[PDB]
Design a protein around this ligand. Structure first.
Ligand SMILES: C[C@@H](O)[C@H](NC(=O)c1ccc(C#CC#Cc2ccc(N)cc2)cc1)C(=O)NO
Ligand SMILES: [Zn+2]
Length: 267
């Protein structure tokens, strides 16, 4: 495909899920060969694995004393639409969580895509690789198209679920909300996370119920969002990715570990 940017400045705002603090976000058009990067307090933070500063419950980027939390959702949308050249300006400490899914980002960007005139240099997975972490596992292997599978153990009514993204079904994961279990809420609050959490932006899961009045968006909404998360983290490779991925109980830390190992092997 051709490199892509946005045809005008796109604006978004809302609290961050973890900081609970309001952020103003502006997506700026950029020329060919610019890449995806964030901008905060006069500092450009490239959307690349080298700038990752934290990876639990979220993926956070940092550079020159400036930090931006929870970049995975907006990066996933950009990855799905193969937007390659924009600057994501942020006033605040965290990307807005909005409704907890990628819908608002996706709808606005898709509506304002500008095709540019240079072919995309894809990150193509060259060979099979497996990363593990005491039960957790992620495997990557060559594929000319992006395919991403996540399988999880939820230990509640959801049980064991899996979902597979293939190119063409991008919109089957952009509505999947971020989620939390009721048994981890106390811990989340204690370590200073989830301060922006509410039923308006988070799917809250119980043992045999959903705390959200409207219930689930999909019968397998959580694993859909996990795929959505992985695609976001995968874009930290610096280019749109072509490969086949399988994640079992993976998280941001394991996602970034795979990214870093893939980057090292193909540099
Ligand atoms: C799922 C993960 O991959 C990951 N999500 C999180 O880490 C996460 C952690 C905690 C919350 C929360 C909350 C709340 C609440 C609340 C509000 C009101 C009442 N009355 C009671 C509870 C949300 C997301 C993620 O998507 N990363 O991209
Ligand atoms: Zn997420």
């Amino acid at each position: 495909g051709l490199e892509k940017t946005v045809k005008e400045k796109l604006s978004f705002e809302g609290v961050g899920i973890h900081t609970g603090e309001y952020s103003k976000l502006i997506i700026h058009p950029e020329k060919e060969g610019t890449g995806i990067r964030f901008f905060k307090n006069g500092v450009y933070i490239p959307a690349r694995h080298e700038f990752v500063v934290h990876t639990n419950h979220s993926t956070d980027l940092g550079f020159k004393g400036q930090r931006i939390k929870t970049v995975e959702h907006i990066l996933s949308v950009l990855h799905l639409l193969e937007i390659t050249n924009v600057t994501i300006e942020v006033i605040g400490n965290e990307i807005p969580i909005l409704d907890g899914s990628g819908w608002e980002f996706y709808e606005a960007i898709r509506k304002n895509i500008l095709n540019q005139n240079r072919e995309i240099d894809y990150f193509v997975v060259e060979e099979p690789i497996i990363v593990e972490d005491e039960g957790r596992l992620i495997k990557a292997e060559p594929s000319d198209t992006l395919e991403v599978t996540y399988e999880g153990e939820f230990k509640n009514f959801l049980g064991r679920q899996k979902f597979t993204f293939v190119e063409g079904n991008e919109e089957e994961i952009v509505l999947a909300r971020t989620f939390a279990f009721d048994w981890e809420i106390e811990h989340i609050k204690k370590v200073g996370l989830g301060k922006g959490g509410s039923l308006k932006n988070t799917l809250v899961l119980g043992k045999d119920k959903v705390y959200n009045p409207e219930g689930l968006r999909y019968e397998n909404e959580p694993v859909r969002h996990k795929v959505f998360d992985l695609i976001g983290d995968l874009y930290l490779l610096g280019s749109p990715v072509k490969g086949k991925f399988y994640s079992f109980r993976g998280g941001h830390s394991l996602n970034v570990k795979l990214v870093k190992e893939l980057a090292k092997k193909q540099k």
